[PDB]
Amino acid sequence: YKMESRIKDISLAEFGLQDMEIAKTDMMGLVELQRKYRDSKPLKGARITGSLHLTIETSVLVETLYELGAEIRWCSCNIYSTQDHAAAALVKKNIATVFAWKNETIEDYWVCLNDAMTWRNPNDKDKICGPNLIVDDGGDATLILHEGVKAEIEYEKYNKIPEYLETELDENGKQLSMDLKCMYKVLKMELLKNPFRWRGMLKDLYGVSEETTTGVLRLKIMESEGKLLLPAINVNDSVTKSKFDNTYGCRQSLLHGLFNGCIQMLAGKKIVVLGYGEVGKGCAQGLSGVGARVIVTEIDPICALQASMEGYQVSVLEDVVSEADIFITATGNKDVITVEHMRKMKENAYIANIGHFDDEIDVYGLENYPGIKVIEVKQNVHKFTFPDTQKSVILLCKGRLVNLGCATGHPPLVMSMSFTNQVLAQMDLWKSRELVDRSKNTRFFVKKLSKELDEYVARLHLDVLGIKLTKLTETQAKYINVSINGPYKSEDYRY
Amino acid sequence: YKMESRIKDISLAEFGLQDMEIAKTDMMGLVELQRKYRDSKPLKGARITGSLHLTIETSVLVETLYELGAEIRWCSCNIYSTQDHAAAALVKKNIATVFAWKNETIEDYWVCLNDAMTWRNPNDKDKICGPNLIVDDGGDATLILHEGVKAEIEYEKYNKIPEYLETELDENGKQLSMDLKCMYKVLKMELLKNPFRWRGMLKDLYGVSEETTTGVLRLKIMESEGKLLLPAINVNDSVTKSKFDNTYGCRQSLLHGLFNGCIQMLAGKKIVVLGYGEVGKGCAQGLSGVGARVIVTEIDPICALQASMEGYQVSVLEDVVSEADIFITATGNKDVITVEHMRKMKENAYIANIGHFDDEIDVYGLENYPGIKVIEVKQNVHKFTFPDTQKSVILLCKGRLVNLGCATGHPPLVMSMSFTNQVLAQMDLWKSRELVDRSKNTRFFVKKLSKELDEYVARLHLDVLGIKLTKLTETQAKYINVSINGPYKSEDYRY
Amino acid sequence: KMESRIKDISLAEFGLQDMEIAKTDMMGLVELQRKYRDSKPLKGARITGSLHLTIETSVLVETLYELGAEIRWCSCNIYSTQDHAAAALVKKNIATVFAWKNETIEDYWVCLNDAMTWRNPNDKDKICGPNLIVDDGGDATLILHEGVKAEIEYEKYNKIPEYLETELDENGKQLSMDLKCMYKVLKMELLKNPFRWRGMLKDLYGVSEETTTGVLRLKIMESEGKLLLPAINVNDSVTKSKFDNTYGCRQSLLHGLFNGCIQMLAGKKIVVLGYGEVGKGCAQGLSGVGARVIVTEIDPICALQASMEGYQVSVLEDVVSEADIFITATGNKDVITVEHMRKMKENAYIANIGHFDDEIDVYGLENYPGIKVIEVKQNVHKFTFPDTQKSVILLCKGRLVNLGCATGHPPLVMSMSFTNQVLAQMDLWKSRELVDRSKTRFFVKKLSKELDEYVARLHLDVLGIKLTKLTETQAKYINVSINGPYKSEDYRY
Amino acid sequence: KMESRIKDISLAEFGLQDMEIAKTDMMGLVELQRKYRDSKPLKGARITGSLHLTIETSVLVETLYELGAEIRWCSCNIYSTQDHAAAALVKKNIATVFAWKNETIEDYWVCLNDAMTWRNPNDKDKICGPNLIVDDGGDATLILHEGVKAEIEYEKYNKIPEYLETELDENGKQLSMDLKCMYKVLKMELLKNPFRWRGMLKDLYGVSEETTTGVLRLKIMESEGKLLLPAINVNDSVTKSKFDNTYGCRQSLLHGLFNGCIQMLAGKKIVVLGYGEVGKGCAQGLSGVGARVIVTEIDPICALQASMEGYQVSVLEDVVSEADIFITATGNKDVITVEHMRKMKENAYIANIGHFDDEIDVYGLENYPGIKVIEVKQNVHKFTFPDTQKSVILLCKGRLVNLGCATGHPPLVMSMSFTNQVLAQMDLWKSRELVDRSKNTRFFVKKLSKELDEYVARLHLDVLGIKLTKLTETQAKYINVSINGPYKSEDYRY
């Protein structure tokens, strides 16, 4: 009787269970949903698949979904972010089937995702079937689904494996990213097992809730091109998520990540924060809090002025690359820090990325620079030395998100706010499942939760911090044209 | 009070003219618009009436509108905000016809507004006509126009002066505010002169651009009930206005206000910021900057958490009113500090308002409290002593916006940003005047400026602060799905 | 009243009202008045004061008055006097005042001289001096020493000394107007009575110095063996230097910048020259409103401290063309020269917060050939160079900006500084029998840590502070008394 | 004896690589090696060190070694050792080490005693002592003095003193575990040789103390006339106290809390007890990440300073129930008692950043009748009272949290503190001839000059790209100083 979950160690379960209980002290949003909905079980019968950093905080999310009645299969959306003790808790209590561990190979990542997406047909002659709902962080669960369908249609056309899957090259001629090569390797394997797999999932698939900015961007592109195959909810852009998680969460988790990976003192150092959006604002605020001299880079004139108003210098990377001490990428873009920028940096300069993917820093070009010399400084920290100048740079966790790679990500309070939106999004998608009609080619769309619910998430966490909310009088409520119980701001308010 | 300005002292012109030139160093947005459009003159022929705090920064606005071809008549939107040397400058160099001075009585304020609205067309027998466009701040120019129209329709329904314009009481038997009585006093006088005055203005009236949150509130109410009789542009909600003027403007001008009117040290004091919106955030940020212990009051749970995340205590006024030292209202609401709260305050507590109207603090109840003792500490600073406790509270400029009442308001940089949106809004309203056809549509809506123009306002002020903007490469532009030249964010982005 | 020279006596009512409001936070002075107004430990003492006559200073004068002293006062700067504060004192016959806002440099020295002059009680109509001096900057102390030096040189040759009658100095450089007018007053007094200043030594028992610059002048006199009276360094009390110098300026520099400079401080590059106690406060306040502070320093320890607070530390010559605003806080000379001013960007603002105007080369700027000056507003001037046609805006002619363009530090910190002043005066007065002028060099000393802690205790209730009390076991473990002192003499706080 | 006692020698390679990376910011120690490795001013000196064996400490040890010293070392806390750092020293034969993370209190004093034990081979293998001591907290100095004191008492009545063979103190109260284990070692040494400690005095030339608590101990001995060797107070150097104690903690406290405490610090009411040099840095760090800092103080001067930074100042009793996290930074005892802990809210965190664990009543907590304890993770324990069922979470049994749950201060500030240490060691060695034992003379505690203090700041300016301005002839004369310093009077507080 072997277990189907693949994790590091099951005996670490008890530590994970005690950390979940401690975290729950601050996660009053998820604690309230469990208290309120565990009897009625609003998600009963739902098969949920999650692709999201399996941390302690996430384990409480999965438990919340379980207590509400869903069967769950889960994996991580990054090779370095899983907390093995959190994973073990879920498996020990039989809360969810898990395919996740810390320090996975890229190939392991894609097999764990595919397995998480695979469901056995219960009492209907066991064969392949998919999930009903998806919890996604970065869009990888959503991508494999879409790329699977695309690969299957292309397969029937010529009745053979599509040429783009087998090849290692791309449209241009350069080497494909390891992430793509492994994803294609898995799709090719599934075409040989069963070429109707991905399209078979669509009939019982009712929606996906996306957690982060980069995943939402991917979802919006598909929506405008009319290629979105399931309804979706943008959890990232809820006020109680983007204004707290992205900003305040990072203020603390970036520092935790830098302290663990970088041995140096952040005070007095020139630290460049590339991108001054919701994540960058938080990164800059924490770095200043500990004495760093932050220097910002931006493409957006509005964001540039905001950094300027907070006392920060705004330069282009090329003018400070030789004097700066530390570089933190928070743009969600690609090739922000190139091999050529890295060759100009000072001795032992530190490079980190807090964006979702490792495309911001050119890690592939760094690792494959002719005659590069690399050494492990500690777990998930590497020093690269160029052969011509003999100068080095220290990269934190191969360009993957530093707060989750070298630390544990955001703390429970802000995660409960993000995850309360997730549960509320999952319920909305599940309760609406009847409107999803697969007959007429009705395009699928991306929507946000109501402001009513967004304020509700905030109300659920006021007691954690001993916040005493003032209440409006009928006259006051009428004077500012709002209901005593809200909402209190118009739909375009920016907080 | 016809075509000859009415100011305090013309001899102050040279000081006003030199401060304008110094201010222009940072008001690059307005400087660029003058350089760009003074030849073509897009506003040529427009009669503009402005109701906005007549400061040095506003003079540059009026100059800009004048250089673009407009004829202008201006007044202030507050009895204490006018800067007499700024008003003289406009009159001396003959840029506009001004009706404003510092420390006006409420009676004269409404006369000044009514005078700025009155024009004499020299082509059609020198008859009384109205303005083509209105620059409003607080919605008073818009209010007198709409109330005037309702007064004329009510005047013809019975062929007599309506009862509400003569009585000093409202529907509940309470005394009407001096501002309503003084406005009704003007409307009555205009019904006797010409009962078709306000309805006559509407024919040539093509728009209004509103500056502040409180004015937009009034516009939204009218709009939703189909009572807005002219097109409107909401300048307040432009990113380059709301997130800079409201927040960073107050961060500096609140302190200037308190330093001039309040003699005590702010460091270590418990200062209560009521409302943690865009103005409140800036207030708290400035106060903390000089060592104060800020305590926040809120009705909005999201804003309450935002305050909490910045390390601020969030309480209801009743729990801290006895121990707190200073009180700052920034809600844009009414009855936030009642007489009963003022009686519980400690000896020499200071009270100030930074919202647009004096309604936040019950100033009328305090001044008319039986046996109240009142003395002038300095110009626009009064100490009120209650007879039963012998305790005193010190009120800054009778509850009117303290930054403009006790000091000179926000500095030129953010006002240039706020005023670059104003000029662009006037040009929009004027260029699209042909689309206003009253034989078809008499009810209008409020719109905001595009994000293209919003980002443009920001480009114009980058060089002021030595800001270096990064430029996206084609690959980066394509990867994040935006144009190299912008816009760089989606319409729902909150910056 | 009769003697006094002030602007307007009608402003007295507003001054008295401000004093009462200020007293809410100045619990130190209020307490000293409550406790010592009956016994009057300073009764019969004649006290002369040279210190920025502000509302806060009027409460100090009122306190010294309630404790029994007879007072004559003047300001230590030509722009810092608050006319309503000086009126309040005259109207209540608390002191004979010689001070007004916007004095000429010449009148400044005539006021100080008048403050130092006292008619001999009811004995006759002969002139004598003060028993005690309250000084800020060292000018009251300087005129006494230069007056004695001038009288000795007078009797040695039986004529006026040549150095008092010349307008050029050592290397043919024009003398500062402050020396010009001081020597002018000294020459006038040698003609009326060549024993005036030396006669004041007989009854002069001490001086209490308020600021860092004045203290430097005292220690130089002490080390050269030329100090003619005992002195107390009030500036170096923990309750003065750690609060007045730092947190005082954090608020009052901003007040002054907001009144003189119309521009927004957010995002601007503001150079703070000197990162001492005043510099630290300046930087903290500037950052609080979004400025990007750049620091200059000579001390590598203070430079590293600046670096730890996230500030860029540079030499002025590398940032003078790009910086927007300049704040000198070194207490040194020629920190900003005319050459530096010519490299500055159009409409760059320059200001000083140190005690004297010497930090900026104002005289060189005003006298630059072809220079064109215009008055922007009260005590704010725009200077324009003839060759480049570029301009710089100087605040209140290089004199201390917080008191020049605004009203100085708030009451709370001044109370801490002035409670130390009153305590210094009481000390000097109680030891007047030990001053024997017929044997002895005088020394500069400081108040004890006990009195330093006492000053702090007197201001805790203002801010609602709840102090913890050590148990006997804890007091023994950390080796202190329950009632203090809690730190060693070398503790830096 | 002769060989080291450490966790794992294979960790040495990681230790050496972290040392090399740390040297980028420790230009004080790098400059001292460059300058003095050839002349070797410490040549022949035997040095025993009791100081947290971290990577930063390993560079200190390496510096003393490059200057010609023979070294024996141990940690000054049971949880502060970094095993890779300890192993790096043993691999290069830089020193003989007795230290590892998670020592039992017994093993602590045994290691310290071993580090003090020198095998002089020029006398056919016979025991002697060190020439110089580098100390942090005063334990090396404590075992020396108490050792001497025990031998004098032993020799008086010719038997083992009864105060060493007992669980009780002067008033029948149980002795701290550290005293019993120290005494257990002192008794052992009386049995082997009752002249051991007094024999060390002959060649012992001095001690350089790192921290505030150890300095307090030294000053008490000085005033009572019981100090047995010259001492140099390194804590009170300006380049130590104003940087290490304040800015070091600003970062290392947050690192410790982040590793030990899973919760978000933003919006929480965090109580910082003591607003001294350490308290100031802690509060500054906590505010930086959005916490609401509440301060407790006994000193009204320090209380007003807190108030000037916008912090509420309260007595612990009025906030113990509502506060979320408690950080002791007083250097005192019984600042947080069992009775305070019983009133705290569910899952309140408690930590100490003072040198010793006495600030929190840990012994009382662990021995409370019916208390239930569980290990949450490495060095983090949750205690649950049986009557209320409420729990408190203690970080690393009340020991300095920055070094116990994290890796202490970063290299830059430690280089400043340790550059002072080396200079203090060189001073004590240079002046060894002035120590005349054959007289019974009083020994004093002295501080390094302001000249060498400014010198330490100069050696680190380049690390952060600081361009220092230089005084002109006229300016120097105006402020009455030399162009090359010192620039401040001795009483200046920075």
Ligand SMILES: NC(=O)c1ccc[n+]([C@@H]2O[C@H](COP(=O)([O-])OP(=O)(O)OC[C@H]3O[C@@H](n4cnc5c(N)ncnc54)[C@H](O)[C@@H]3O)[C@@H](O)[C@H]2O)c1
């Ligand atoms: N963890 C580290 O890395 C580190 C670094 C430096 C110093 N330290 C240690 O931290 C402790 C404090 O060092 P310091 O330099 O701040 O000393 P300090 O004297 O500057 O600060 C201690 C403060 O605590 C206050 N205090 C004493 N008892 C109190 C009580 N019962 N309640 C409230 N306040 C009280 C005192 O008034 C004093 O201001 C020392 O034990 C020192 O060894 C630790």
Ligand SMILES: Nc1ncnc2c1ncn2[C@@H]1C[C@H](CO)[C@@H](O)[C@H]1O
């Ligand atoms: N990384 C570190 N390595 C070694 N020593 C450290 C470290 N961080 C802090 N310290 C010292 C600990 C001591 C309190 O006992 C303080 O005086 C600090 O100097």
